Design an enzyme around this catalytic site. Structure first.
Site, short mmCIF file in Angstrom:
data_model
loop_
_atom_site.label_atom_id
_atom_site.label_comp_id
_atom_site.label_asym_id
_atom_site.label_seq_id
_atom_site.Cartn_x
_atom_site.Cartn_y
_atom_site.Cartn_z
N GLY B 10 34.62 25.75 17.80
CA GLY B 10 35.35 25.76 19.05
C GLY B 10 36.42 24.69 19.04
CE1 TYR B 11 39.19 26.23 23.66
CE2 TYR B 11 41.22 25.13 23.04
CZ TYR B 11 40.56 26.18 23.65
OH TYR B 11 41.28 27.18 24.25
CE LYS B 36 26.44 34.40 18.92
NZ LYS B 36 25.09 33.87 18.58
CB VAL B 79 23.27 26.76 14.76
CG1 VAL B 79 22.30 25.60 14.88
CG2 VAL B 79 24.46 26.39 13.87
CD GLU B 167 42.93 29.55 34.81
OE1 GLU B 167 42.08 29.46 33.89
OE2 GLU B 167 44.13 29.23 34.65
CD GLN B 315 43.87 17.14 29.11
OE1 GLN B 315 44.43 16.05 29.16
NE2 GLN B 315 43.71 17.91 30.19
C1 LIG Z 1 38.33 31.38 31.55
C2 LIG Z 1 38.02 29.94 31.04
C3 LIG Z 1 39.23 29.26 31.24
C4 LIG Z 1 39.33 27.89 30.89
N1 LIG Z 1 40.60 27.16 31.10
C5 LIG Z 1 40.70 25.79 30.74
C6 LIG Z 1 41.99 25.06 30.95
O1 LIG Z 1 42.89 25.61 31.39
N2 LIG Z 1 42.08 23.68 30.59
C7 LIG Z 1 40.92 22.99 30.02
O2 LIG Z 1 40.99 21.80 29.71
N3 LIG Z 1 39.67 23.73 29.83
C8 LIG Z 1 39.57 25.11 30.19
N4 LIG Z 1 38.32 25.82 29.98
C9 LIG Z 1 37.14 25.12 29.41
C10 LIG Z 1 37.20 25.13 27.87
O3 LIG Z 1 37.40 26.43 27.42
C11 LIG Z 1 35.89 24.64 27.31
O4 LIG Z 1 35.59 23.40 27.88
C12 LIG Z 1 36.01 24.50 25.79
O5 LIG Z 1 35.85 25.73 25.20
C13 LIG Z 1 34.90 23.56 25.27
O6 LIG Z 1 35.08 23.34 23.88
P1 LIG Z 1 33.85 23.66 22.90
O7 LIG Z 1 34.36 23.77 21.50
O8 LIG Z 1 32.79 22.56 23.01
O9 LIG Z 1 33.20 25.01 23.38
P2 LIG Z 1 33.54 26.44 22.76
O10 LIG Z 1 35.00 26.71 22.89
O11 LIG Z 1 32.76 27.47 23.50
O12 LIG Z 1 33.13 26.44 21.20
C14 LIG Z 1 31.91 27.05 20.80
C15 LIG Z 1 32.07 27.58 19.33
O13 LIG Z 1 30.96 27.45 18.70
C16 LIG Z 1 30.36 28.91 18.45
N5 LIG Z 1 28.96 28.91 18.69
C17 LIG Z 1 28.31 28.76 19.88
N6 LIG Z 1 26.97 28.82 19.63
C18 LIG Z 1 26.80 28.99 18.29
C19 LIG Z 1 25.67 29.11 17.51
N7 LIG Z 1 24.24 29.10 17.80
N8 LIG Z 1 25.78 29.28 16.17
C20 LIG Z 1 27.02 29.34 15.59
N9 LIG Z 1 28.14 29.22 16.37
C21 LIG Z 1 28.03 29.05 17.72
C22 LIG Z 1 30.97 29.69 19.28
O14 LIG Z 1 31.06 31.11 18.72
C23 LIG Z 1 32.36 29.07 19.37
O15 LIG Z 1 33.14 29.44 18.28
C24 LIG Z 1 38.23 27.22 30.35
C25 LIG Z 1 37.02 27.91 30.15
C26 LIG Z 1 36.92 29.26 30.50
C27 LIG Z 1 35.63 30.13 30.33
#
Ligand SMILES: Cc1cc2nc3c(=O)[nH]c(=O)nc-3n(C[C@H](O)[C@H](O)[C@H](O)COP(=O)(O)OP(=O)(O)OC[C@H]3O[C@@H](n4cnc5c(N)ncnc54)[C@H](O)[C@@H]3O)c2cc1C
Ligand SMILES: Cc1cc2nc3c(=O)[nH]c(=O)nc-3n(C[C@H](O)[C@H](O)[C@H](O)COP(=O)(O)OP(=O)(O)OC[C@H]3O[C@@H](n4cnc5c(N)ncnc54)[C@H](O)[C@@H]3O)c2cc1C
Ligand SMILES: NC(=O)c1ccc[n+]([C@@H]2O[C@H](COP(=O)([O-])OP(=O)(O)OC[C@H]3O[C@@H](n4cnc5c(N)ncnc54)[C@H](O)[C@@H]3O)[C@@H](O)[C@H]2O)c1
Lengths: 394, 395
Positions: B10-11, B36, B79, B167, B315
């Site tokens: 993810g991010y 995943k 995982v 949104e 962010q």
């Molecule tokens: C509609 C929506 C709009 C948003 N708009 C904004 C915005 O405008 N500005 C802002 O700052 N934030 C925004 N957010 C929040 C932001 O998207 C999340 O906070 C961000 O995705 C978090 O980063 P992350 O990598 O930790 O999570 P994720 O992006 O969800 O990363 C998870 C990654 O790990 C994978 N994964 C998960 N579980 C497993 C597993 N067991 N095994 C293997 N892989 C796995 C997933 O497939 C994915 O690729 C928004 C969220 C949503 C739903």
């Protein structure tokens, strides 16, 4: 002026109405055309939007665009019953009175009393139904990526291997590559199964064409189960009879192309019918009635040469409408009717976008040639009802 | 020789991996990236394909394209568990061992034990989920023409009036004209209902922005029910509490944007968590572990200026990844770590394709200006991970 009421704006009904429009004068009679919808759909093309290969708007046209409001009064409503004695037609939101009645309410699905078929299976018989089928299938494919074990999402059962079933699975086979790409689906997991109770696919058709069709469709991954009837239908799929033993197919989508019958309103109105259809006289009138005419799938015509009935087709339905329009005009003018003679020039069946099979004028056709023939034949109908403008508009 | 394992692309994860890619040299350490899927999706844009306003392919990119196969070894698997004692990660199709671990598994929906919410409601959190929601909605509209009495087909309930919910209903409102035309539906019959337990829409946000947002969305026929919690969810719809009394909404579609929690794998692996998230040390490490790092939504951070927690956002997730990449490189090379300092710039919330609200650079923004602002901000992320080519690929 005498009042003519036409029930159903299908192939028979719309041609009858347009026929009366051309033949009759600006006040000779009152003509009211009743339809379930404000549009007329091209039933022969409905297999394509059902598969998603063609947009549904290309398979329908607004009735008000086709007719003249001065000569024809269009009524958008649902026919509920016909009272022969009172000469009245009952609608959901009204009532109508007729001097002459033309019945072209089309077919209804024939489920043969098979359990769950009505509840859990789909039919290719309207714009509403084909959109429902199309969106249903795409919904199942969308669900699959999250649930990879459920291959029943990717299984489509088409019951009945007649012309409708064969054309539909052909469109389905073409759609699968794009559909799989859209939903990250492994194409090899997709199962399109065409199940036929009869010993062969397309029973009572030329074996050379049938074997060709199976080869082509088999090439695109379509599966055929022949001599296999569908005992019953469930939300999980269908139950079939194999080697005297019941077997289950788990399929998220079941499409029923097993058979059609005349609209039940006709039989319910007290007409004597065979498979819901009225065996009309040589003037296409219902027996014992001089003012009632039956057209399209509601009408039954027997072949003099062999005691087998003519199949319910758009081709013969169009011919019914032209004959009825002519006879009604003469009848109003105190003239003499002309007996109906069907002229079946043969039919062509599509096998996807680029392939087809047919017997036209006793001569067999295949491939791109047959495919263009069907497109040309269907284009001819558009010209008939809408002129060159309708042909260009689509 | 040392092995670095990053869980989740993810991010937080993708930035951490790319950060290590740029900073470290060949053969300094072994880096494995687990995901995943073979693609990385732009989570912040997922509301658009869920409504159908934008194609889902525009919200994801292939992971192998972004990374260097020489420097980073990508593994496509799921995982299952983390074993802290053995320093081993359990997968569906294997097992892995780490000297250093980076956890960025993201959020999971939080239904708070509300009955039927988990089973019968939808979530906007992946490419799979948004395609499911989108096709579900179009299916209901397709069914309506055959059954005009069933207006529940035309009713969509969105639970939670937070950033995500607002949104989403915005995208939904823009989609409705095209959707109605496609299925012969009377637009007046369509009901988009956003249900919030809190007294106001967008709780904890500036009232000036909130009033503008409600005005724009309300004009497009969006309905708001405030001070109304969801008692339970059924396939037929939801039960809500109005004036202390149960009330029913019949809706074929229910979308839950009410809350999120840390991925349950973290909790299941024996870590100490608050609402599924780990309250990390100043170096984004899990407490009691010097080699385990937490990024993105899995990590919980408190602001020193005001003792309120930072919200789980893309962010801050990006900033987590950059910080962890720098610190991991330093620890291996014997350098000194840098404590994480968040620099939270403004954010914009879209209200359909042509409208938006935000506070950017301390100044409130509206309309076309805010919309273009949001598109550029998201474009900056595309550049960060994919360079000019990825930005170009979104043309
Ligand atoms: C509609 C929506 C709009 C948003 N708009 C904004 C915005 O405008 N500005 C802002 O700052 N934030 C925004 N957010 C929040 C932001 O998207 C999340 O906070 C961000 O995705 C978090 O980063 P992350 O990598 O930790 O999570 P994720 O992006 O969800 O990363 C998870 C990654 O790990 C994978 N994964 C998960 N579980 C497993 C597993 N067991 N095994 C293997 N892989 C796995 C997933 O497939 C994915 O690729 C928004 C969220 C949503 C739903
Ligand atoms: C996929 C498919 C492909 C086909 N391809 C061919 C082909 O290639 N060549 C060929 O010759 N035949 C073909 N057919 C058969 C042909 O379409 C039918 O024979 C033809 O539709 C029958 O004409 P009809 O007007 O009597 O019936 P319909 O076309 O069904 O006309 C019925 C009309 O009346 C309306 N209506 C029905 N009930 C009511 C009611 N209670 N109240 C008010 N309005 C009502 C309907 O909305 C409709 O507009 C195909 C059929 C299908 C399903
Ligand atoms: N290209 C064309 O000319 C064309 C195209 C479509 C339809 N049509 C006409 O429209 C009419 C209706 O077409 P249709 O295909 O829907 O019906 P159909 O009667 O032509 O064929 C349906 C098939 O379903 C099979 N079937 C019945 N019960 C079954 C069961 N329990 N399990 C498995 N299979 C079963 C029957 O054997 C039959 O072959 C036909 O008379 C047909 O001639 C013509």
């Amino acid at each position: 002026k005498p009042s003519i009421v036409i029930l159903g704006a299908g192939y028979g009904g719309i041609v009858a109405a347009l026929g009366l429009q051309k033949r009759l004068n600006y006040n000779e009679a009152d003509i009211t055309l009743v339809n379930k919808n404000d549009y007329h759909y091209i039933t022969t093309e409905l297999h394509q939007p059902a598969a998603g290969t063609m947009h549904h708007d290309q398979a329908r046209v607004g009735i008000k665009e086709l007719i003249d409001e001065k000569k024809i009064k269009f009524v958008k409503d649902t026919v509920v019953a016909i009272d022969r004695e009172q000469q009245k037609v009952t609608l959901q939101n009204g009532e109508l009175h007729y001097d002459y009645l033309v019945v072209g309410l089309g077919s209804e699905p024939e489920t043969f009393g098979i359990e769950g078929l009505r509840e859990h299976a789909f039919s290719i018989n309207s714009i509403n139904s084909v959109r429902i089928i199309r969106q249903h299938i795409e919904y199942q494919f969308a669900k699959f990526a999250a649930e990879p074990e459920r291959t029943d999402y990717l299984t489509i059962v088409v019951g009945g291997a007649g012309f409708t079933g064969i054309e539909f699975v052909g469109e389905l086979a073409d759609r699968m590559p794009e559909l799989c790409a859209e939903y990250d689906v492994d194409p090899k997991l997709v199962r399109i199964i065409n199940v036929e109770a009869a010993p062969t696919v397309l029973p009572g058709f030329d074996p050379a064409l049938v074997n060709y069709a199976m080869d082509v469709l088999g090439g695109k991954g379509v599966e055929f189960k022949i001599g296999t009837p569908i005992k019953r239908c469930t939300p999980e799929g269908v139950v079939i009879e194999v080697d005297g033993e019941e077997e289950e197919i788990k399929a998220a989508t079941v499409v029923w192309t097993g058979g059609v019958r005349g609209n039940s309103i006709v039989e319910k109105s007290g007409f004597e019918t065979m498979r819901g259809r009225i065996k009309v006289d040589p003037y296409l009138r219902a027996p014992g009635h001089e003012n009632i005419f039956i057209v399209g799938d509601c009408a039954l015509i027997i072949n003099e040469e062999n005691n087998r009935p003519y199949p319910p087709t758009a081709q013969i339905a169009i011919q019914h409408g032209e004959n009825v329009a002519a006879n009604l005009a003469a009848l109003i003018r105190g003239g003499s009717m002309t007996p109906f003679k069907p002229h079946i020039r043969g039919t062509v069946a599509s096998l996807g976008r680029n392939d087809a099979i047919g017997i036209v004028g006793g001569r067999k056709v295949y491939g791109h040639a047959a495919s263009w023939l069907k497109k040309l034949i269907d284009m001819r109908y558009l010209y008939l009802i809408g002129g060159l403008s309708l042909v260009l508009k689509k």
